[PDB]
Amino acid sequence: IFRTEEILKAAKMPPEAVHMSRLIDAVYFPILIILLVGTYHMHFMLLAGDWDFWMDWKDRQWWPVVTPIVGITYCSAIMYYLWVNYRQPFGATLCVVCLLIGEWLTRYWGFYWWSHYPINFVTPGIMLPGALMLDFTLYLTRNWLVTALVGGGFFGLLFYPGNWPIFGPTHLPIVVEGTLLSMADYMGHLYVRTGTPEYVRHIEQGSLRTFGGHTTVIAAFFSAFVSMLMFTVWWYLGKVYCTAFFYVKGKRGRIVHRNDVTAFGEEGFPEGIK
Amino acid sequence: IFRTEEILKAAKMPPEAVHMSRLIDAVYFPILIILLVGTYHMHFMLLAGDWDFWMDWKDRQWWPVVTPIVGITYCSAIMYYLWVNYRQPFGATLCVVCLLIGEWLTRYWGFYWWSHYPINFVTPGIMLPGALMLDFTLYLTRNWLVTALVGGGFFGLLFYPGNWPIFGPTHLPIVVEGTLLSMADYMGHLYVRTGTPEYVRHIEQGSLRTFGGHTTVIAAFFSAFVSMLMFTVWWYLGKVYCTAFFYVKGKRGRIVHRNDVTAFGEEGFPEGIK
Amino acid sequence: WFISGPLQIGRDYEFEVNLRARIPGRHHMHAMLNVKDAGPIAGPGAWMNITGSWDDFTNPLKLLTGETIDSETFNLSNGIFWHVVWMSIGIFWIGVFTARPMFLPRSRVLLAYGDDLLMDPMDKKITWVLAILTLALVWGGYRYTENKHPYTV
Amino acid sequence: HGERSQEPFLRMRTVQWYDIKWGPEVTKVNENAKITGKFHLAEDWPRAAAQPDFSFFNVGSPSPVFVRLSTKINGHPWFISGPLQIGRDYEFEVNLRARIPGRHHMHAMLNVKDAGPIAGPGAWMNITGSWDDFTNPLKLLTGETIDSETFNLSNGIFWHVVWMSIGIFWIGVFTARPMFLPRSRVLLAYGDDLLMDPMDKKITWVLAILTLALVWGGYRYTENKHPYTVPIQAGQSKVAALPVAPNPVSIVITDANYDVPGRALRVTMEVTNNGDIPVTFGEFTTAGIRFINSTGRKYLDPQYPRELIAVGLNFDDESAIQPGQTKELKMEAKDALWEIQRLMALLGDPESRFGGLLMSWDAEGNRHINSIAGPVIPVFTKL
Amino acid sequence: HGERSQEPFLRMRTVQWYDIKWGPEVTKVNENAKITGKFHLAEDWPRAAAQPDFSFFNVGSPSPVFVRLSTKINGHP
Amino acid sequence: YDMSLWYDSKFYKFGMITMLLVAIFWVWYQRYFAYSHGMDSMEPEFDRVWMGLWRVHMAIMPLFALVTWGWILKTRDTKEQLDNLDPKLEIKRYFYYMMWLGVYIFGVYWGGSFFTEQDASWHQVIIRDTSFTPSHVVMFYGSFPMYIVCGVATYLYAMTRLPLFSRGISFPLVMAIAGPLMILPNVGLNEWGHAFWFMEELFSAPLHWGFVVLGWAGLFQGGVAAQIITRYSNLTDVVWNNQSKEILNNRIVA
Amino acid sequence: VYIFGVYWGGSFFTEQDASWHQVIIRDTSFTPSHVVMFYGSFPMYIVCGVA
Ligand SMILES: [Cu+2]
Ligand SMILES: [Cu+2]
Ligand SMILES: [Cu+2]
Ligand SMILES: [Cu+2]
């Protein structure tokens, strides 16, 4: 219903070759999924996992700025790989889905079932709408620079509105011992973190140069701007990550870079197959 | 009176071609002047404009060090462009002239006629003798490394003596409320800057390791030394700024860097013109 | 002392911590003073016993807006619901492409014939529909949350 | 003009200004003016605002319509910023001279090193005359009379014109002949042999000699005309704070709430008059805003701006606290002035806290000042 | 030997030494010597000089011609 | 000889005078509405004046972009017309491309130089920087997008009327335009730094160093002019020296 | 297999460590978590990688 038979006919694959290709896909794609889970999860948690773990770290200054900048990195590289090599537009969504799968597994088994923290206190939460819109921008524009601009803007801007339905109810006010707190703050105080005291929270604190009514908005744009840079940089990193050569040697013992080329991609190879 | 007819005869230009070349010069040179004004002015003001704006920021430690290091950057790149492409030795002087034109326009219209500050309080002032000597060194030596060394030394050393006639009289002592001040300091206090308090001045403060009689001299040499580095670095940046290629594509959809070449510069092209 | 603050050296302080039993067992319960750069300063410990069941734990709180909640089960279904919705959308987007030859035939066609046969109008329709749905869902969720909870700190 | 944007909790608990006099209201150009006042650094200094270890007293003028002749904190000339103590009171006096005619709102500010500007109350001052009649005659230590408006003006312009003329000549000696395309073709086809001109070498040598000679000559001329010069002054200013006045009133805040869909500040306090004479509260001051009652109205500056004065201070028991008596009071500061200065914006603050100055008077007219602070709770009247 | 180079305002308003005794004037090798004194930290401590939050009392000798057996501020080693 | 066959400057002059008049109008608006209605950001008159001007900019500049880009893309030359282009018309079109570059660079001068020191000038007569301060409206929301439109339009024209630019992608031109273009999103960094612990007192502050790094891309004028001069020399050889046209189509092929 | 080992080492047995870092006073060196990953999962994937 898509155009798969035409693609297979253009590739000149006999039925056994088609079955072998299907087996290659079924073997390699789960491997890529697991690698994305592991590596992207490590990168995200060790760069932005602290705001990710706890409800009271989700603030208006650092969370919506740090999170998208860290998240765009693997997404840009994987999108480069998929789009450039196979014309597949689901890179960023796949990255964020893998990250969320790993995050949910660790929160349920590590934080909750081992450390006895409640599940609602460790919602990560989502970063998916921005990745989806970035994928849609890359597919519709087909240009990676226009994709950098527009998709990075979307990725940096849609983070806070997309997470507001999850963490908005946690901002309801409570009064404890005559002191006003957000419900996330009282959840953080209620469930003791022996290794995490209050003063380590890198959250907003207000300033005499600060417009309290615009804070998130400013954080929504700065995180966007850097994203437009970061994407671009990591897009070039994708070209570094796709570098596939061999160190061959001969005679004097000299080492030369050698590239294995696809024979089907040559000038007259497809016509001579028949 | 120079040798222009010989140059035109060597270029094999018919009179209509000469007129077309003159029109190209008359169109492009003002564009380059305006671009230098804008971009160089932005770079200078956002890296070293604070010492530039006010009389009381012109000190013995930070002003004569920060100013030449920031100023040498655009000068080196524009000198590279002009000398390498057209053998024109007026790069640094053109950069500093454009910077001063922009600075004077903004001081008269922005600081004075809009913000009501006096003109004498916002003299920038000049950085021109160092640029002139750098241009002369580049022309006379014809080597850009010897130019880097000697011209960077000149640029970093001649800054303070060249500005002393302008800001030397501003250092005369005054006594206000039994306290000694420099006349620049009293000018700074007299004309209120709501956004600029006293403590933000990055100026000398003295130290127990400091030889007060040698301060400027040391600042004259350090600013020179870094200049000798900076020039060199930005000279290579000039080669980056002159990179002129196209991303052409064909067939598989592969993109290749392509360079458009000058036909007159080939081996036998000039002889076959006739 | 919900928010950390400064303390004076050479001065004495009194502390009181009020707690509520959550998990049964025998547990050594200490006093600590976490200092900004020094780190944790642990204190004496004593064994305290909790008898009961963790599934009988309830912590009923009352909010300033006038709603009663339970700290153990608060904003639990909301976050899981939004996670499930967005993850389902993402899984559909991923799996609409992992249903056909995806790695080798595409590579051969792209390296021998360009991307002309690799672009599918049906994928364009799906992309447009999903982009509209994503933007509409973001706006709708934001407006629904801001209408359900007008006052938040 | 911008102080209301500043988060309330911050300003409310940083600098507490009081007794601020602006005058004269209308002054001619080249005449003297003065802004005097006092300020208390609140003990509840917010964490967001850094400690005033480098404080400069500034003037919030629309532009330099006044030339700041002097600024003195307590009695020490505050030309250089310096440290101030929290919980201590200071007096300031700013002496100015009229420069630009017009009507201008003239404020007090305390710029703190890392916290930023802390603006204060403002009043409208009028200058009548002409900006072209402004003269500021000063006398230097070396024995010369100058005018600050026109000082070192012709010198800088002259040197700029000279150096710019030299630079323009250097640039334009080359922008008078084929400069871009023929040079490029000749260089790319024949090298630089035909691109080097001996006349350009002569010009370069002459101009280099002239430039070096001009630098040396200007330096020597300036050092011969002004043998004695001082560098740019720096350091810090230091003044002892005003002595702590004995306060017979001790106040402990127990509760405080503010209406979110409204304008009101309700504070519950326990007051103790451990002195020997009855004491009656009359004024609550915060962010320059003043809430007064009959007692506060009795001792009120008739020339203080009326746009920051609100007769809305109400107590449950408006009786004088007898000596040796502890009483529970509930103060209610309610007026539209809370909406103008945005007490409303405490709901989006990361620290919901109030602070201010509560003023009380004796039967004989002696004034006591207490800096009160606490946490405020939002009250949702819409519910 | 170098103190005069140090800017006056700084030294003048930092440590105010007083009652300084050096002795004995002439001592043989392997014999004991003592430098005693008092100093006042001026209230007008210059901004250029940082606060003495880490102060070490040192000896300005041409070289280790003396081995510093002990240094005691007030009475604390 | 006939000047008009390879040179025309009416559009360049019109654009220059129009940009100058727009800048003069911005200056007059600032000098007439800043001290009386721009001091307080919470006053209704501040809204009616400066946020009204901001809304005018937000409604006009996208219209400017739409009109210019649509006209440039609509009157496009087909690949057939770009393959048998008259070299005299190619010289005229390269002059037009240089004039588009000149208009773009005039916009960059207005945005980055004049209406920036005028902002530092405003930063010293106000308590603290706001977000829609008189200055911002004219540049951040006016001058910034203005030059960006011209930049896109410049490239657009080139890669639509110049065969070489329609063939390969002028690397230098890309950066030359992308630089000041990416400068506008750096307003987010500017605001985030001003509002939080990146300090605000200095104008030459580290948060203001994003603009200099992004405007360094304006120095790719060297590569842009190298391409222009190489093509101009080739056109001079073809038209006047009676040389073969093959030099125009040999080096930018696959 | 190598990538499964990397997933076990870097993702699962790492947030489980952050989880352990909050129920203990301070990080040790052979904490329950470390033993399983630092000394177990880490070398495990390394062997697979070389292999
Ligand atoms: Cu005002
Ligand atoms: Cu000595
Ligand atoms: Cu600004
Ligand atoms: Cu660990």
Going from the C-alpha of A246 to that of each of A28, D85, D326, G2, the distances in angstroms are 22, 69, 89, 21
Residue D87 contacts residue D41 (beta carbons within 8 Å): yes
Instruction: Locate the chain A residue with the closest alpha carbon to F131.
Output: A211
Please classify residue D130 by burial: count the beta carbons closer than 10 Å to its beta carbon, then call 0-12 exposed, 13-18 middle and 19+ buried: exposed
Q: Do D167 and B97 count as a contact with CB atoms less than 8 A apart?
A: yes
Bond prior to A173 in cis (omega within 30° of 0): no
Query: Helix, strand, or coil here: C60?
Result: strand
Q: Enumerate the residues of chain C whose CB falls inside 8 A of the CB of residue G26.
A: 39-40
- E neighbours by CB contacts (3+ pairs under 8 Å): B, D
Q: Do D178 and B7 count as a contact with CB atoms less than 8 A apart?
A: yes
- Packing angle of the helix pair B91-106, B128-141 (nearest 10 deg): 170
CB of B199 within 8 Å of a chain E CB? The answer is: no
Query: Helix, strand, or coil here: F96?
Result: helix
Instruction: Locate the chain G residue with the closest alpha carbon to A99.
Output: G11
Q: What's at D204, amino acid-wise?
A: T
Instruction: Locate the chain E residue with the closest alpha carbon to D237.
Output: E47
Distance, in Å, from the CA atom of A96 to the CA atom of A74, rounded to the nearest integer, reads: 9
- Packing angle of the helix pair D153-172, B91-106 (nearest 10 deg): 140
Q: Enumerate the residues of chain F whose CB falls inside 8 A of the CB of residue B62.
A: none
Q: Enumerate the residues of chain F whose CB falls inside 8 A of the CB of residue A228.
A: 182, 185
Q: Nearest CA to B112 among B57, B191, B36? A: B191
Whether there are 3 or more C-beta pairs closer than 8 Å between C and G is yes
- What is the maximum span of chain G, computed from C-alpha positions, in angstroms? 39
Q: Do D140 and B24 count as a contact with CB atoms less than 8 A apart?
A: no
The technique is cryo-EM
Bond prior to A125 in cis (omega within 30° of 0): yes
Q: What's at D65, amino acid-wise?
A: V
Residue E37 CB coordination number (10 Å): 11
Residues across chain C: 153
Q: What's at F237, amino acid-wise?
A: D
Distance, in Å, from the CA atom of A11 to the CA atom of A264, rounded to the nearest integer, reads: 9
Q: Enumerate the residues of chain E whose CB falls inside 8 A of the CB of residue D238.
A: 44
- β-strands C60-62, C68-70 pairing: antiparallel
Q: Enumerate the residues of chain D whose CB falls inside 8 A of the CB of residue B166.
A: 152, 155-156, 159-160
Identify the residue whose tokens are 């004695």.
D228
- Packing angle of the helix pair A15-53, A91-106 (nearest 10 deg): 60
Q: Is the dihedral of CA D51, D54, D56, D60 positive or negative?
A: negative
Residue D108 contacts residue F127 (beta carbons within 8 Å): no
Identify the residue whose tokens are 């800096």.
D371
Query: Helix, strand, or coil here: F132?
Result: coil
Residue D300 CB coordination number (10 Å): 15
Bond prior to B125 in cis (omega within 30° of 0): yes
Alpha helices by DSSP H, B12-119:
15-53, 63-86, 91-106
Identify the residue whose tokens are 């002592």.
B173
Distance, in Å, from the CA atom of D66 to the CA atom of D33, rounded to the nearest integer, reads: 9
Q: D350 is written with which tokens?
A: 């990361």
Q: Which of D7, D49, D255 sits opposite A212 (nearest CB)?
A: D7
Q: Enumerate the residues of chain A whose CB falls inside 8 A of the CB of residue D117.
A: 208
Going from the C-alpha of B32 to that of each of B39, B44, B102, D132, D329, the distances in angstroms are 10, 17, 14, 40, 74
Distance, in Å, from the CA atom of B41 to the CA atom of B38, rounded to the nearest integer, reads: 5
Chain G residues whose C-beta is within 8 A of a chain A C-beta are: 3-4, 6-12, 14-16, 18-27
Distance, in Å, from the CA atom of F244 to the CA atom of F234, rounded to the nearest integer, reads: 10
B185 annotated to a ligand binding site: yes
D2: left (phi over 0), alpha (psi -120 to 50) or beta: left
Q: Do A168 and C128 count as a contact with CB atoms less than 8 A apart?
A: no
The minimum CA-CA distance between F74 and chain D, rounded to whole Å, is 33
Q: Which of A42, A115, A195 sits opposite G11 (nearest CB)?
A: A42
Identify the residue whose tokens are 């590279």.
B80
Query: Helix, strand, or coil here: B60?
Result: coil
The minimum CA-CA distance between C27 and chain G, rounded to whole Å, is 12
Please classify residue E76 by burial: count the beta carbons closer than 10 Å to its beta carbon, then call 0-12 exposed, 13-18 middle and 19+ buried: exposed
Instruction: Locate the chain B residue with the closest alpha carbon to C117.
Output: B252
Distance, in Å, from the CA atom of F63 to the CA atom of F149, rounded to the nearest integer, reads: 10
Q: Do A207 and D48 count as a contact with CB atoms less than 8 A apart?
A: yes
Residue pairs spanning B and E at CB distance below 8 A: 19
Query: Helix, strand, or coil here: B254?
Result: strand
Give the torsion through C-alpha atoms of B55, B56, B57, B61, to 10 deg: 120
Alpha helices by DSSP H, chain F:
10-37, 44-46, 52-74, 79-83, 87-109, 115-123, 134-138, 144-161, 163-167, 171-183, 186-195, 209-215, 221-240
Q: Enumerate the residues of chain A whose CB falls inside 8 A of the CB of residue F131.
A: 211, 214
Q: Nearest CA to B219 among D164, E10, D231, D211? A: D231
Q: A64 is written with which tokens?
A: 């919506």
Distance, in Å, from the CA atom of A72 to the CA atom of A152, rounded to the nearest integer, reads: 8
Q: Do A110 and G12 count as a contact with CB atoms less than 8 A apart?
A: yes
Q: Enumerate the residues of chain B whose CB falls inside 8 A of the CB of residue C113.
A: 252
Q: A198 is written with which tokens?
A: 């209050």
- G neighbours by CB contacts (3+ pairs under 8 Å): A, C
Q: Do A165 and C78 count as a contact with CB atoms less than 8 A apart?
A: yes
Residue D362 contacts residue D277 (beta carbons within 8 Å): yes
Q: Which of A61, A145, A221 sits opposite F196 (nearest CB)?
A: A61
Q: Do F117 and B34 count as a contact with CB atoms less than 8 A apart?
A: no
Residue F188 contacts residue A224 (beta carbons within 8 Å): yes
Q: Do F30 and B250 count as a contact with CB atoms less than 8 A apart?
A: no
Residue F72 CB coordination number (10 Å): 20
- Give a three-class secondary structure readout of chain D: CCCCCCCHHHHHCCEEEEEEEEECCEEECCCEEEEEEEEEECCCCCCCCCCCCCEEEEEECCCCCEEEEEEEECCEECCCCECCCCCCEEEEEEEEEECCCEEEEEEEEEEECCCEEEEEEEEEEEEECCHHHCCCEEECCCCCEEECCCCCHHHHHHHHHHHHHHHHHHHHCCCCCCCCHHHHHHHHHHCCHHHCCHHHHHHHHHHHHHHHHHHHHHHHHHHHHCCCCCCCCCCCCCCCCECCCCCCEEEEEEEEEEECCCCCEEEEEEEEECCCCCEEEEEEEECCEEEECHHHHHCCCCCCCHHHEECCEEECCCCCECCCEEEEEEEEECCCHHHHCCHHHHHHCCCCEEEEEEEEEECCCCEEEEEEEEECEEECCCC
Element housing B182 (H / E): strand B179-182
Distance, in Å, from the CA atom of D11 to the CA atom of D19, rounded to the nearest integer, reads: 17
Instruction: Locate the chain D residue with the closest alpha carbon to A213.
Output: D348
- C neighbours by CB contacts (3+ pairs under 8 Å): A, B, D, G
Give the torsion through C-alpha atoms of B53, B54, B59, B61, to 10 deg: -40
Query: Helix, strand, or coil here: B242?
Result: coil
Q: G23 is written with which tokens?
A: 């129920």
Q: Do F102 and B30 count as a contact with CB atoms less than 8 A apart?
A: yes
> Which ligand number lies closest to the CA of residue G22?
4
Q: Enumerate the residues of chain F whose CB falls inside 8 A of the CB of residue B248.
A: 167-169, 252-254
> Which ligand number lies closest to the CA of residue E1?
2
Please, what is the end-to-end C-alpha distance for chain E in angstroms?
27
Please classify residue F234 by burial: count the beta carbons closer than 10 Å to its beta carbon, then call 0-12 exposed, 13-18 middle and 19+ buried: buried
Q: Do D2 and F125 count as a contact with CB atoms less than 8 A apart?
A: no
Instruction: Locate the chain B residue with the closest alpha carbon to C115.
Output: B253
Identify the residue whose tokens are 């950001």.
F41
Instruction: Locate the chain E residue with the closest alpha carbon to D238.
Output: E44
D40 annotated to a ligand binding site: no
Q: Which of A7, A21, A189 sits opposite C117 (nearest CB)?
A: A7
Residue B222 contacts residue B66 (beta carbons within 8 Å): no
Going from the C-alpha of E57 to that of each of B267, C8, E76, the distances in angstroms are 78, 28, 12
Distance, in Å, from the CA atom of D139 to the CA atom of B173, rounded to the nearest integer, reads: 10
Going from the C-alpha of F178 to that of each of D305, F12, F148, F220, the distances in angstroms are 53, 22, 8, 11
Q: Nearest CA to D283 among D363, D354, D356? A: D356
F123 annotated to a ligand binding site: yes
